[PDB]
Design a binder for this molecule. Structure first.
Ligand SMILES: O=c1[nH]ccc2cc(O[C@H]3CCNC3)c(Cl)cc12
Length: 309
């Protein structure tokens, strides 16, 4: 988890800005626009009027007694300790007139589910950079805070015009989840069977997210030989889909379109047995080592694709 000079400096400049804000209050915010929704909430792009800082404000509507909300706010304080170039910045949390507010760093490229809608499909070299950021974010959360994400999916991966890729919406408050109490289509087979689940279930979710972004479609059930012929040249109810994840072979990338290293990488993420599934091993996988040495202009690709500007 060692940082380069540029990463260390950006992290230092975020904390210095954060120290100037102080106590977050409802009336100190002006709504600019809506960014997205949401695991039981809506996210707005806001102006924090006293400090002049543009933030992303997540609003969760919850009607509960003062007892429960005071514990939720104290449980969200753990987010002030998460400082990584792969984890979205956190400003603070508060409660006001029936709703919890989570204030965080604004990512101007939005989430990868929105980038995927625009782009159609994301190239392999760009997915290499996304894979590194997700592995490094998951490593940080586990090593420094003994927590796992539990909800890896394209909508929980944020991107910006500086070429940064960061994870958001990892559950840290037990009381907040209980009071509420999202899709289960990215959950590993062992999680859907209520069995033994570790950080291995997040690796499955990553592999699944990568296949979806590479092909430009949620990958279950697999596309037919004619669907792939349309795409590259070369309905299912949620309960049926969850049964398919548990009982059928895992999805895979089509061949002769992606490199064998990218194919091998997603196959190792998507092995149904959590013990056979790769863990440290992903960081030294051929696809990851090749992608780390590649000089990919992610910010450039992103700005051109979504029209950022
Ligand atoms: O700029 C952001 N910073 C922090 C958080 C955040 C969350 C966002 O969308 C939620 C709603 C859908 N999935 C994640 C979106 Cl679209 C943007 C941000």
């Amino acid at each position: 988890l060692e940082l380069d000079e540029q990463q260390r400096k950006r992290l230092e400049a975020f904390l210095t800005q954060k120290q100037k804000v102080g106590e977050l209050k409802d009336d100190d915010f002006e709504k600019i626009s809506e960014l997205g929704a949401g695991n039981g909430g809506v996210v707005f792009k806001v102006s924090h009027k006293p400090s002049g800082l543009v933030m992303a404000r997540k609003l969760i509507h919850l009607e509960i007694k003062p007892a429960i909300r005071n514990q939720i706010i104290r449980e969200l304080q753990v987010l002030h300790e998460c400082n990584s170039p792969y984890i979205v910045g956190f400003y603070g949390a508060f409660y006001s007139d029936g709703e919890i507010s989570i204030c965080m760093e604004h990512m101007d490229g939005g989430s990868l589910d929105q980038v995927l809608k625009k782009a159609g499909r994301i190239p392999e070299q760009i997915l290499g950079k996304v894979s590194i950021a997700v592995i490094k974010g998951l490593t940080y959360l586990r090593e420094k805070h003994k927590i796992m994400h539990r909800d890896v999916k394209p909508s929980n991966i944020l991107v910006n015009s500086r070429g940064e890729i960061k994870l958001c919406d990892f559950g840290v408050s037990g009381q907040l989840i209980d009071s509420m109490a999202g899709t289960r289509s990215y959950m590993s087979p062992e999680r859907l069977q209520g069995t033994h689940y570790s950080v291995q279930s997040d690796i499955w979710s990553m592999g699944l997210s990568l296949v979806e972004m590479a092909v430009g479609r949620y990958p279950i059930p697999p596309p037919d030989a004619k669907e792939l012929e349309l795409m590259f040249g070369c309905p299912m109810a949620i309960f049926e889909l969850l049964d398919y994840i548990v009982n059928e072979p895992p999805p895979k990338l089509p061949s002769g379109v992606f490199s064998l290293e990218f194919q091998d990488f997603v196959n190792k993420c998507l092995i149904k047995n959590p013990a056979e599934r790769a863990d440290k091993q992903l960081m030294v996988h051929a696809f990851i080592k090749r992608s780390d040495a590649e000089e990919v202009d992610f910010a450039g690709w992103l700005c051109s694709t979504i029209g950022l500007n």
